[PDB]
Coordinates of C-alpha atoms and ligand atoms in Angstrom, one line a residue:
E8 CA 9.9 -19.1 -5.4
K9 CA 9.8 -16.7 -2.4
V10 CA 7.2 -15.3 0.0
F11 CA 5.8 -12.2 -1.7
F12 CA 6.5 -9.4 0.8
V13 CA 4.6 -6.2 0.7
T14 CA 5.0 -3.4 3.3
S15 CA 3.4 -0.1 4.2
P16 CA 5.3 2.6 6.0
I17 CA 5.2 2.5 9.8
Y18 CA 3.4 5.6 11.0
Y19 CA 4.4 8.2 13.7
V20 CA 2.1 7.7 16.6
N21 CA 2.1 11.5 17.6
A22 CA -1.5 11.8 16.3
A23 CA -4.4 9.4 15.9
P24 CA -4.7 7.7 12.6
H25 CA -6.4 9.5 9.7
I26 CA -7.2 9.0 6.0
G27 CA -3.7 8.7 4.6
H28 CA -2.3 6.1 7.0
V29 CA -5.3 4.3 5.8
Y30 CA -4.7 5.0 2.1
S31 CA -1.0 3.9 2.4
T32 CA -2.0 0.6 4.2
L33 CA -4.9 0.2 1.7
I34 CA -2.5 0.0 -1.3
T35 CA -0.3 -2.3 0.7
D36 CA -3.3 -4.5 1.5
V37 CA -4.7 -4.5 -2.1
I38 CA -1.4 -5.6 -3.6
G39 CA -1.1 -8.4 -1.0
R40 CA -4.7 -9.5 -1.7
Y41 CA -4.0 -9.7 -5.4
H42 CA -1.0 -11.9 -5.0
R43 CA -3.1 -14.1 -2.7
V44 CA -5.8 -14.5 -5.3
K45 CA -3.0 -15.6 -7.7
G46 CA -2.3 -18.3 -5.1
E47 CA 1.1 -17.0 -4.2
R48 CA 2.6 -17.0 -0.7
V49 CA 2.1 -13.5 0.8
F50 CA 3.4 -11.6 3.8
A51 CA 2.0 -8.0 4.1
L52 CA 3.4 -5.8 6.8
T53 CA 2.2 -2.6 8.5
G54 CA 2.6 -0.9 11.9
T55 CA 3.8 2.1 13.9
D56 CA 7.0 4.2 14.3
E57 CA 7.0 4.9 18.0
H58 CA 10.5 6.2 19.0
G59 CA 12.3 9.6 18.5
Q60 CA 11.9 13.2 19.2
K61 CA 8.7 14.0 17.3
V62 CA 6.8 11.3 19.2
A63 CA 8.5 12.0 22.6
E64 CA 7.6 15.7 22.4
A65 CA 4.1 14.7 21.3
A66 CA 3.8 12.7 24.5
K67 CA 5.2 15.5 26.6
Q68 CA 2.9 18.1 24.9
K69 CA -0.1 16.0 26.1
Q70 CA 1.4 15.4 29.6
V71 CA 1.5 11.6 29.4
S72 CA 4.2 9.0 29.7
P73 CA 5.7 8.0 26.3
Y74 CA 5.5 4.3 27.3
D75 CA 1.8 4.8 27.9
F76 CA 1.3 7.2 25.0
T77 CA 2.9 5.1 22.2
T78 CA 0.8 2.1 23.4
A79 CA -2.4 4.1 23.4
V80 CA -2.1 5.6 19.9
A81 CA -0.7 2.3 18.6
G82 CA -3.9 0.7 19.7
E83 CA -6.0 3.3 17.9
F84 CA -4.2 2.5 14.7
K85 CA -4.7 -1.3 15.2
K86 CA -8.4 -0.7 16.0
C87 CA -8.7 1.5 12.9
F88 CA -7.0 -1.0 10.6
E89 CA -9.0 -3.9 12.0
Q90 CA -12.2 -1.9 11.3
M91 CA -10.9 -1.2 7.8
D92 CA -11.1 -4.9 7.1
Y93 CA -7.6 -5.3 5.7
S94 CA -5.7 -8.6 5.3
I95 CA -2.4 -7.5 6.8
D96 CA -0.4 -10.4 8.2
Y97 CA 1.4 -8.5 11.0
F98 CA 1.3 -5.2 12.9
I99 CA 4.8 -4.1 14.0
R100 CA 5.8 -1.6 16.6
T101 CA 9.4 -0.3 16.9
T102 CA 9.1 -0.4 20.7
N103 CA 8.9 -4.2 20.4
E104 CA 11.9 -5.9 22.0
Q105 CA 12.6 -8.1 19.0
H106 CA 12.8 -5.1 16.7
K107 CA 15.3 -3.4 19.0
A108 CA 17.4 -6.6 18.7
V109 CA 17.6 -6.3 14.9
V110 CA 18.5 -2.6 15.0
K111 CA 21.5 -3.6 17.2
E112 CA 22.4 -6.5 14.9
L113 CA 22.1 -4.3 11.8
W114 CA 24.0 -1.5 13.5
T115 CA 26.9 -3.8 14.4
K116 CA 27.1 -5.0 10.8
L117 CA 27.2 -1.4 9.6
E118 CA 30.0 -0.7 12.2
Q119 CA 32.1 -3.8 11.4
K120 CA 32.2 -2.9 7.7
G121 CA 33.9 0.3 8.7
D122 CA 30.9 2.4 7.4
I123 CA 30.2 4.1 10.7
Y124 CA 32.4 6.7 12.4
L125 CA 32.3 9.3 15.1
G126 CA 31.7 12.8 13.6
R127 CA 29.8 16.0 14.0
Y128 CA 26.6 17.1 12.3
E129 CA 26.1 20.9 12.3
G130 CA 23.1 21.7 10.2
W131 CA 19.3 22.0 9.9
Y132 CA 16.8 19.5 11.0
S133 CA 13.0 19.2 10.8
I134 CA 11.8 17.4 13.9
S135 CA 8.3 16.9 12.5
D136 CA 9.9 15.1 9.5
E137 CA 12.9 13.7 11.5
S138 CA 14.8 14.8 8.4
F139 CA 18.3 16.3 7.9
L140 CA 18.2 19.2 5.5
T141 CA 20.8 21.3 3.7
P142 CA 20.3 25.1 3.5
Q143 CA 19.1 24.9 0.0
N144 CA 16.0 23.0 1.3
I145 CA 14.9 25.5 3.9
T146 CA 13.4 29.0 3.6
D147 CA 11.7 31.7 5.6
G148 CA 8.1 31.4 7.0
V149 CA 6.1 31.6 10.2
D150 CA 4.9 28.1 11.3
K151 CA 5.6 29.3 14.8
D152 CA 2.2 30.7 15.9
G153 CA 3.5 34.3 16.0
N154 CA 7.2 34.6 15.4
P155 CA 9.1 34.2 12.1
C156 CA 11.3 31.1 11.5
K157 CA 13.0 29.0 8.9
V158 CA 10.9 26.1 7.5
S159 CA 11.4 22.9 5.5
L160 CA 10.9 23.3 1.7
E161 CA 9.7 19.7 1.6
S162 CA 7.2 19.7 4.5
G163 CA 6.8 23.3 5.5
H164 CA 7.5 22.4 9.1
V165 CA 9.8 24.3 11.4
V166 CA 13.5 23.5 11.1
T167 CA 16.0 24.1 13.8
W168 CA 19.8 24.1 14.0
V169 CA 21.7 21.2 15.5
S170 CA 25.4 21.0 16.4
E171 CA 26.0 17.5 17.8
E172 CA 28.8 14.9 18.0
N173 CA 26.9 12.2 16.2
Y174 CA 27.7 8.8 14.8
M175 CA 28.0 9.1 11.0
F176 CA 27.3 6.6 8.2
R177 CA 29.4 6.8 5.0
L178 CA 26.4 7.3 2.7
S179 CA 28.8 9.3 0.5
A180 CA 30.8 6.1 -0.2
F181 CA 27.6 4.5 -1.7
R182 CA 26.8 7.0 -4.4
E183 CA 28.1 5.3 -7.5
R184 CA 26.7 1.9 -6.4
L185 CA 23.2 3.4 -5.8
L186 CA 23.5 5.0 -9.2
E187 CA 24.4 1.6 -10.7
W188 CA 21.5 0.0 -8.9
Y189 CA 18.9 2.5 -10.2
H190 CA 20.1 2.0 -13.8
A191 CA 20.4 -1.7 -13.9
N192 CA 17.0 -2.0 -12.3
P193 CA 14.8 0.7 -13.9
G194 CA 11.6 -0.6 -12.3
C195 CA 13.1 -0.3 -8.8
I196 CA 11.3 2.9 -8.2
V197 CA 7.8 3.6 -9.4
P198 CA 6.5 5.9 -10.7
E199 CA 9.2 6.7 -13.3
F200 CA 9.2 10.4 -12.6
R201 CA 10.2 9.8 -9.0
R202 CA 13.0 7.5 -10.2
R203 CA 14.2 10.4 -12.3
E204 CA 14.1 12.5 -9.2
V205 CA 16.1 10.2 -7.0
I206 CA 18.8 9.8 -9.7
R207 CA 19.2 13.5 -10.0
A208 CA 19.6 13.9 -6.2
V209 CA 22.1 11.2 -5.9
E210 CA 24.1 12.2 -9.0
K211 CA 24.4 15.8 -7.6
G212 CA 26.1 14.2 -4.6
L213 CA 25.6 12.5 -1.2
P214 CA 26.9 13.6 2.2
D215 CA 27.4 11.3 5.1
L216 CA 24.4 10.6 7.3
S217 CA 24.0 11.2 11.1
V218 CA 22.8 7.8 12.3
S219 CA 22.8 8.8 16.0
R220 CA 21.7 11.6 18.4
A221 CA 22.9 12.9 21.7
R222 CA 20.9 11.0 24.3
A223 CA 19.3 14.1 25.9
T224 CA 18.0 15.5 22.6
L225 CA 15.6 12.6 22.0
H226 CA 14.4 12.5 25.7
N227 CA 16.1 9.1 25.9
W228 CA 13.2 7.8 23.8
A229 CA 15.2 5.8 21.3
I230 CA 17.3 2.6 21.1
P231 CA 20.8 2.9 22.6
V232 CA 23.7 2.8 20.2
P233 CA 25.5 -0.5 21.0
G234 CA 28.7 0.2 22.9
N235 CA 27.8 3.8 23.5
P236 CA 24.9 4.4 25.9
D237 CA 25.5 8.2 25.5
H238 CA 24.0 7.8 22.0
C239 CA 20.6 6.9 20.6
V240 CA 20.2 5.4 17.1
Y241 CA 18.6 7.6 14.5
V242 CA 14.8 7.1 14.5
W243 CA 14.9 6.5 10.7
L244 CA 17.5 3.8 10.8
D245 CA 15.4 2.3 13.6
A246 CA 12.2 2.8 11.5
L247 CA 13.5 1.4 8.1
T248 CA 14.7 -1.7 10.0
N249 CA 11.1 -2.7 10.7
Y250 CA 11.1 -4.2 7.2
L251 CA 14.0 -6.5 8.2
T252 CA 12.4 -7.3 11.6
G253 CA 9.0 -8.1 10.1
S254 CA 10.7 -10.4 7.6
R255 CA 12.3 -12.4 10.5
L256 CA 9.4 -12.9 12.9
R257 CA 7.4 -16.1 13.1
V258 CA 3.8 -15.1 13.8
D259 CA 1.0 -17.3 15.3
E260 CA -2.5 -17.9 13.9
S261 CA -4.0 -14.9 15.8
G262 CA -1.3 -12.4 14.6
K263 CA 1.3 -12.2 17.4
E264 CA 5.1 -12.6 17.3
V265 CA 6.5 -15.9 18.7
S266 CA 10.1 -16.0 17.5
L267 CA 12.8 -13.9 15.9
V268 CA 14.7 -16.0 13.4
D269 CA 18.5 -15.4 13.2
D270 CA 18.7 -15.8 9.4
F271 CA 16.1 -13.9 7.3
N272 CA 16.2 -16.8 4.7
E273 CA 14.5 -19.2 7.1
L274 CA 11.2 -17.4 6.6
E275 CA 11.9 -16.5 2.9
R276 CA 10.3 -13.0 3.0
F277 CA 13.3 -10.6 2.7
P278 CA 13.9 -8.5 0.7
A279 CA 10.5 -6.7 0.3
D280 CA 9.1 -7.2 -3.2
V281 CA 7.1 -3.9 -3.0
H282 CA 7.7 -1.1 -0.4
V283 CA 4.5 1.1 -0.5
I284 CA 5.5 4.6 0.5
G285 CA 4.1 8.2 0.3
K286 CA 5.9 10.8 -1.8
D287 CA 7.1 12.6 1.3
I288 CA 9.5 9.9 2.5
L289 CA 11.1 8.9 -0.8
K290 CA 14.7 9.6 0.2
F291 CA 14.7 7.3 3.2
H292 CA 13.6 4.3 1.2
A293 CA 15.3 5.0 -2.1
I294 CA 18.6 6.4 -0.9
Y295 CA 19.3 5.7 2.8
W296 CA 17.7 2.2 3.0
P297 CA 19.5 0.8 0.0
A298 CA 22.9 2.2 1.2
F299 CA 22.4 0.7 4.6
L300 CA 21.6 -2.7 3.0
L301 CA 24.6 -2.5 0.6
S302 CA 26.9 -1.8 3.6
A303 CA 25.8 -4.9 5.6
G304 CA 25.8 -7.0 2.5
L305 CA 22.0 -7.6 2.5
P306 CA 19.7 -8.0 -0.6
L307 CA 18.1 -4.8 -1.9
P308 CA 14.3 -4.4 -2.1
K309 CA 12.9 -5.3 -5.5
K310 CA 10.8 -2.1 -5.9
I311 CA 9.7 1.0 -4.0
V312 CA 6.3 2.5 -5.0
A313 CA 5.6 6.1 -3.9
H314 CA 2.0 7.1 -4.3
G315 CA 0.8 10.8 -4.7
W316 CA -0.4 11.4 -1.1
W317 CA 1.5 12.5 2.0
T318 CA 2.2 10.0 4.8
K319 CA 1.6 12.8 7.4
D320 CA -1.2 15.3 7.7
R321 CA -1.5 18.4 5.4
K322 CA -4.6 20.7 5.3
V331 CA -12.5 16.3 5.1
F332 CA -12.3 12.6 6.0
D333 CA -12.6 10.3 9.0
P334 CA -11.9 6.9 7.4
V335 CA -14.4 4.9 9.4
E336 CA -17.1 7.5 9.5
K337 CA -17.1 7.7 5.7
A338 CA -17.0 3.9 5.3
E339 CA -20.0 3.8 7.5
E340 CA -21.9 6.5 5.6
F341 CA -21.0 5.4 2.0
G342 CA -19.6 1.8 2.3
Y343 CA -16.3 0.0 3.1
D344 CA -15.7 -1.5 -0.4
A345 CA -17.0 1.6 -2.2
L346 CA -14.7 3.8 -0.2
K347 CA -11.7 1.7 -0.9
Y348 CA -12.7 1.6 -4.6
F349 CA -13.2 5.3 -4.7
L350 CA -9.8 6.0 -3.1
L351 CA -8.1 3.6 -5.5
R352 CA -9.9 4.7 -8.6
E353 CA -9.7 8.4 -8.0
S354 CA -6.0 8.9 -7.0
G355 CA -3.1 8.4 -9.3
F356 CA 0.6 9.0 -8.9
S357 CA 0.6 12.7 -9.8
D358 CA -2.8 12.6 -7.9
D359 CA -4.9 15.9 -8.4
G360 CA -8.1 13.9 -7.5
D361 CA -11.5 15.2 -6.5
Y362 CA -12.9 13.6 -3.3
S363 CA -16.1 15.7 -2.8
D364 CA -19.3 14.1 -1.7
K365 CA -20.5 14.9 -5.3
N366 CA -17.8 12.8 -7.0
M367 CA -18.0 9.8 -4.6
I368 CA -21.7 9.6 -5.3
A369 CA -21.0 10.1 -9.0
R370 CA -18.8 7.0 -9.1
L371 CA -20.8 4.9 -6.6
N372 CA -23.9 5.4 -8.8
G373 CA -22.3 5.4 -12.3
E374 CA -19.6 2.7 -11.8
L375 CA -20.3 0.5 -8.9
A376 CA -24.1 0.7 -9.2
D377 CA -24.9 1.2 -12.9
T378 CA -21.9 -0.6 -14.6
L379 CA -21.0 -3.5 -12.3
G380 CA -23.9 -3.8 -9.9
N381 CA -26.4 -3.7 -12.7
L382 CA -24.8 -6.4 -14.8
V383 CA -25.0 -8.8 -11.9
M384 CA -28.7 -8.3 -11.5
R385 CA -29.4 -8.7 -15.3
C386 CA -27.4 -11.9 -15.6
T387 CA -28.9 -13.4 -12.4
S388 CA -32.4 -12.0 -12.9
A389 CA -35.4 -14.5 -12.6
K390 CA -36.9 -12.9 -15.7
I391 CA -33.8 -13.2 -17.9
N392 CA -31.9 -16.2 -16.4
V393 CA -35.1 -18.3 -16.1
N394 CA -33.5 -21.5 -14.7
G395 CA -31.0 -19.9 -12.3
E396 CA -28.4 -21.8 -14.1
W397 CA -25.3 -21.3 -16.2
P398 CA -26.5 -22.3 -19.7
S399 CA -24.3 -24.0 -22.3
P400 CA -23.6 -21.5 -25.1
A401 CA -24.6 -22.3 -28.7
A402 CA -22.4 -21.0 -31.6
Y403 CA -20.7 -17.6 -31.2
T404 CA -21.3 -14.7 -33.6
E405 CA -18.4 -12.4 -34.4
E406 CA -19.8 -9.9 -31.9
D407 CA -19.9 -12.6 -29.2
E408 CA -16.3 -13.4 -30.1
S409 CA -15.2 -9.7 -29.9
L410 CA -16.4 -9.4 -26.4
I411 CA -15.0 -12.9 -25.5
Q412 CA -11.6 -11.7 -26.7
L413 CA -11.7 -8.7 -24.4
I414 CA -12.6 -11.0 -21.4
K415 CA -9.8 -13.4 -22.4
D416 CA -7.3 -10.6 -22.7
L417 CA -8.4 -8.8 -19.4
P418 CA -6.5 -10.9 -16.9
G419 CA -3.1 -10.6 -18.6
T420 CA -3.3 -6.8 -19.0
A421 CA -5.0 -6.2 -15.5
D422 CA -2.2 -8.4 -14.1
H423 CA 0.6 -6.3 -15.5
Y424 CA -1.1 -3.2 -14.1
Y425 CA -1.3 -4.9 -10.7
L426 CA 2.4 -5.7 -10.9
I427 CA 3.7 -2.1 -11.8
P428 CA 1.9 -1.5 -9.4
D429 CA -0.9 0.8 -10.6
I430 CA -4.2 -0.1 -8.9
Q431 CA -5.9 2.9 -10.7
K432 CA -5.0 1.6 -14.2
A433 CA -6.0 -2.0 -13.3
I434 CA -9.5 -0.8 -12.0
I435 CA -9.8 1.2 -15.3
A436 CA -8.9 -1.9 -17.3
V437 CA -11.6 -4.1 -15.7
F438 CA -14.4 -1.5 -15.8
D439 CA -13.6 -1.0 -19.6
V440 CA -14.5 -4.7 -20.1
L441 CA -17.5 -4.2 -17.8
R442 CA -18.6 -1.2 -19.9
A443 CA -18.3 -3.4 -23.0
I444 CA -20.5 -6.1 -21.5
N445 CA -23.3 -3.6 -20.8
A446 CA -23.1 -2.4 -24.4
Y447 CA -23.2 -6.0 -25.5
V448 CA -26.2 -6.8 -23.3
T449 CA -28.1 -3.7 -24.6
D450 CA -27.4 -4.6 -28.3
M451 CA -28.6 -8.2 -27.5
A452 CA -31.7 -7.4 -25.5
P453 CA -31.9 -10.7 -23.5
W454 CA -35.2 -9.7 -22.0
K455 CA -36.5 -9.9 -25.6
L456 CA -34.7 -13.2 -26.3
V457 CA -36.2 -15.3 -23.5
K458 CA -39.3 -15.4 -25.6
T459 CA -38.0 -15.1 -29.2
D460 CA -34.8 -17.2 -29.3
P461 CA -34.1 -19.4 -26.3
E462 CA -31.1 -20.9 -28.1
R463 CA -29.6 -17.4 -28.6
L464 CA -30.2 -16.3 -25.0
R465 CA -28.1 -19.3 -23.9
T466 CA -25.0 -18.0 -25.7
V467 CA -25.6 -14.4 -24.5
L468 CA -26.3 -15.3 -20.9
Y469 CA -23.3 -17.5 -20.7
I470 CA -21.0 -14.7 -21.9
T471 CA -22.5 -12.1 -19.6
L472 CA -22.1 -14.4 -16.6
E473 CA -18.5 -15.4 -17.5
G474 CA -17.7 -11.8 -18.2
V475 CA -19.1 -10.7 -14.8
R476 CA -17.3 -13.6 -13.1
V477 CA -13.8 -12.7 -14.5
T478 CA -14.1 -8.9 -14.0
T479 CA -15.3 -9.7 -10.5
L480 CA -12.3 -12.0 -9.8
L481 CA -9.9 -9.2 -10.9
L482 CA -11.8 -6.7 -8.7
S483 CA -11.5 -9.0 -5.6
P484 CA -8.6 -7.2 -4.1
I485 CA -10.4 -3.9 -4.4
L486 CA -13.9 -5.0 -3.4
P487 CA -13.2 -8.0 -1.1
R488 CA -16.6 -8.2 0.7
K489 CA -18.5 -7.4 -2.5
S490 CA -16.9 -10.0 -4.7
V491 CA -18.0 -12.6 -2.2
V492 CA -21.6 -11.5 -2.6
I493 CA -21.3 -11.4 -6.4
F494 CA -19.9 -15.0 -6.4
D495 CA -22.6 -16.3 -4.2
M496 CA -25.3 -14.8 -6.4
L497 CA -23.5 -16.3 -9.5
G498 CA -23.1 -19.7 -7.6
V499 CA -19.3 -19.8 -8.2
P500 CA -17.8 -22.7 -6.2
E501 CA -15.1 -21.7 -3.7
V502 CA -12.3 -23.4 -5.5
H503 CA -12.9 -21.2 -8.6
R504 CA -12.7 -17.9 -6.6
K505 CA -8.9 -17.8 -6.6
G506 CA -6.0 -19.1 -8.6
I507 CA -4.7 -18.2 -12.1
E508 CA -6.3 -21.4 -13.3
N509 CA -9.6 -19.4 -12.9
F510 CA -8.4 -16.4 -14.9
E511 CA -9.3 -18.7 -17.8
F512 CA -12.6 -18.0 -19.7
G513 CA -14.9 -20.9 -19.0
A514 CA -13.4 -22.2 -15.8
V515 CA -16.9 -22.4 -14.1
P516 CA -18.7 -24.9 -16.3
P517 CA -22.3 -24.7 -17.5
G518 CA -24.8 -26.4 -15.3
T519 CA -23.6 -24.6 -12.2
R520 CA -26.6 -23.3 -10.2
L521 CA -27.0 -19.7 -8.9
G522 CA -27.3 -18.7 -5.2
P523 CA -30.6 -17.9 -3.5
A524 CA -32.1 -14.4 -3.9
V525 CA -33.9 -11.9 -1.4
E526 CA -37.1 -9.9 -2.3
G527 CA -35.5 -6.4 -2.5
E528 CA -31.8 -7.5 -2.3
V529 CA -29.3 -5.0 -3.8
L530 CA -25.5 -5.0 -4.3
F531 CA -24.7 -1.3 -4.5
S532 CA -27.6 1.0 -3.8
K533 CA -27.5 4.5 -5.3
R534 CA -27.0 7.6 -3.2
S535 CA -29.4 10.6 -2.9
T536 CA -30.1 13.0 -5.8
Ligands
LIG601 C1 9.6 2.8 7.9 S1 8.7 4.1 7.1 C2 8.7 5.4 8.4 C3 7.7 6.5 8.1 C4 7.6 7.6 9.2 N1 7.2 7.0 10.5 C5 6.4 8.5 8.8 O1 5.3 8.6 9.5 O2 6.5 9.2 7.8

């Protein structure tokens, strides 16, 4: 058994954080959280990509020192992610001195294997993307305010010509082995249609990669190539290596580096089990990264997951201002429920209220109040169930089956599908509780109401446990209301139906207390 290692991308610090950095780190955070509720060892990583030309020129364009500028923005991200109530284990910055150490270690390995040579790169380059492009991937446009230019087909950003003596990685030598890797491990890229993409790109053919830049081009704002101060190491090799760095750093209780281990095995994190990325940075993680790792004889990641968003601004959301107006758990829910891999989601104020009210408030929120109500649940107690009718069983079967299926969805990973799976069982429970009319049974058939109440409660409990990674603060409130002991709030033991025994007492109530309160109509 290993440490389960989940990563977000590390974000260029040229601009403040926005929705999107937050979405990316949310997925990373939710996966991590789910494996922790399974009781696994987890290490989730996130952070900032602070070197290179893009960022240098961002710092120049605001007339501030890049040493001061990267630190400033980096702090804004940290402040944003802290406000966003994630459970990330470490925040990593490429300016960190221990990271620089690993880049040089990694570089030397790449060199010693005979995989790096001194060449030229003469071709197109998007600075905003820090991406080398061939002429098939650029086209005319006017991203220059006035004048007409050539622009990236991927991003749309301005591309410029570069003719440099650069250090070159033999990425071309790694084609057939990448191709083997993708095939032998067909889950290694998710979603499937982006795996299909990568394999087409790599089967067409791979050129060598320009892993360094002339020192003056970058404004000297990059790590020096070992043994050649005239050169700076390509920001993306620098960036990608954060995953290795992070996997080697002992971190103290309050979240600060203390050591850099020599051997990545010592901490047991590497390779990343899941690399959460945005669709715009697929090639770096799915082609370049593996090929680097294969060269140095390092273990390949286990899977790369590219969501449908961009990682870097395109085209109505301040993350924290929205979480403050609508709710932190509801926002995270909404973002996870609404956006799939091919995306096309609707994020209007209408739709957020639609789901807040319909799903969080009327499906989930409502069930909790019925099954803890003073009027229905008269003794504030988990009752022992009597005999089960076939309907009782039918619903119980769903609740028994839910953890297994929700678990597979969580492992794909597909947080959307998982949330759908849980709320399907939730929807069933409401249907069940309508049919059964407990409010009528308190008076007519006390013995029946026991069976029903028990099933509702245990239904609400398990759905809630599988929703914990999405609604972390709100699951805690639900459990307190239900009176679930702390030892039952976590661990696959407690995926089992009937793990909280009858006799358990509910938590105290407040005269007016609400779990999710509807938004205006
Ligand atoms: C190590 S992932 C690097 C991602 C890059 N900094 C970006 O913002 O897209």
